[PDB]
Each structure stands twice: as structure tokens, then as C-alpha cells.
Design a protein around this ligand. Sequence first.
Ligand SMILES: *[C@@H]1O[C@H](CO)[C@@H](O[C@@H]2O[C@H](CO)[C@@H](O[C@@H]3O[C@H](CO[C@@H]4O[C@H](CO)[C@@H](O)[C@H](O)[C@@H]4O)[C@@H](O)[C@H](O[C@@H]4O[C@H](CO)[C@@H](O)[C@H](O)[C@@H]4O)[C@@H]3O)[C@H](O)[C@H]2NC(C)=O)[C@H](O)[C@H]1NC(C)=O
Ligand SMILES: *[C@@H]1O[C@H](CO)[C@@H](O[C@@H]2O[C@H](CO)[C@@H](O)[C@H](O)[C@H]2NC(C)=O)[C@H](O)[C@H]1NC(C)=O
Lengths: 49, 48
Amino acid sequence: DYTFNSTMEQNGCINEAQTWDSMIEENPDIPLDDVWGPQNYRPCFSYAI
Amino acid sequence: DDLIVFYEYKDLGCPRLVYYDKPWKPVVELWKNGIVEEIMNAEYVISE
Ligand SMILES: *[C@@H]1O[C@H](CO)[C@@H](O[C@@H]2O[C@H](CO)[C@@H](O[C@@H]3O[C@H](CO[C@@H]4O[C@H](CO)[C@@H](O)[C@H](O)[C@@H]4O)[C@@H](O)[C@H](O[C@@H]4O[C@H](CO)[C@@H](O)[C@H](O)[C@@H]4O)[C@@H]3O)[C@H](O)[C@H]2NC(C)=O)[C@H](O)[C@H]1NC(C)=O
Ligand SMILES: *[C@@H]1O[C@H](CO)[C@@H](O[C@@H]2O[C@H](CO)[C@@H](O)[C@H](O)[C@H]2NC(C)=O)[C@H](O)[C@H]1NC(C)=O
């Protein structure tokens, strides 16, 4: 129960981004520290990724 | 005959929309270093 200010559009995500829930669902058992980070950043203004 | 076409979103993107029995010519733009600089006004052709 905590949300944010804007949506996926109105900021410029041309394609589907990466959000916290999808990243958590991605990594099953490992602590939250190694789930999402700068080694895993994929940009959303992408059109091709 | 039974010809089939495989659309590629990633190469192309969302395709344009035009309607039946309307005179249309595309508008083409020239880009230098990822910057819009001038509309192209020279002779060009299209094909399939
Ligand atoms: C802070 O966070 C914000 C987002 O919340 C970031 O803001 C965005 O940063 C992007 C990177 O600097 C800006 O880049 C855009 O990327 C688009 C890429 O699209 C290309 O399209 C061609 C085909 O034409 C492909 O070949 C390429 O591979 C790409 O897919 C560009 O289209 C886009 O250009 C314009 O952007 C304006 C933004 O107003 C649009 O109105 C316009 O229609 C067109 O899309 C641009 O180059 C992005 O603009 C920017 N967004 C905003 C709202 O600011 C910041 O970068 C983050 N801060 C830092 C320091 O990084
Ligand atoms: C998100 O909510 C914030 C409120 O904090 C909005 O921020 C405003 O942005 C405008 C645009 O420049 C500023 O003039 C206001 O001063 C800002 N308000 C505040 C209280 O800081 C923002 O517009 C919202 N974003 C969206 C997409 O709705």
C-alpha cells in the first residue's frame, strides 16, 4: 500500500517498462537486494528491448 | 496463391492508416544525427 505520482505514459515510456511487482515476481527466492539494481536496468524509452 | 505475410513490430512499429479511394502521398523527413532538419522534397519512388 504505497503508490506514485504518474503513469507509464505522461512520462514517455514508448514500450513496456520494468516495475517493482514484475521484478519481484521475476526473482523467486533471493532477497530483495539482488532483485532489481543497476546491473539489471533496462530502459523503457526503448522501442526494441 | 496462398501467400502469407509476417508482420514485424520491432523492425517497423505501428503501421500507418489510410482509407479507400483517397489520393495520398507520404510525407518523408530527412534526419541528421537524430535531429529533424528538413522535409524531403526531391523525386522519390515507392515499391512492393
Ligand atoms: C529522468 O527520467 C525521465 C523520465 O521520467 C527521463 O526523460 C526521458 O529521457 C529520455 C532519454 O534522455 C528522452 O529520450 C527520448 O527517447 C525517444 C527514443 O525514441 C527513438 O525513436 C527512434 C525512431 O524515431 C528509434 O530509432 C530510437 O531507437 C528510439 O526508439 C525519442 O523518441 C525522444 O524524442 C522525443 O521526445 C520528446 C519528449 O518530450 C517527445 O515529445 C517526442 O515525441 C519524441 O519522442 C527522446 O529522444 C526522453 O525525451 C525523456 N522524457 C522526458 C519526458 O523528459 C530523463 O532522461 C531522466 N533523467 C536523466 C538525467 O536521465
Ligand atoms: C504529480 O504530482 C505532483 C504534485 O507534487 C505534480 O507536481 C506539480 O507539477 C507542476 C508542473 O510543473 C508544478 O507546476 C507544480 O508545482 C507541482 N506540484 C507540486 C505540489 O509540486 C505533478 O504534476 C503530478 N504529475 C502528474 C503526471 O500528474
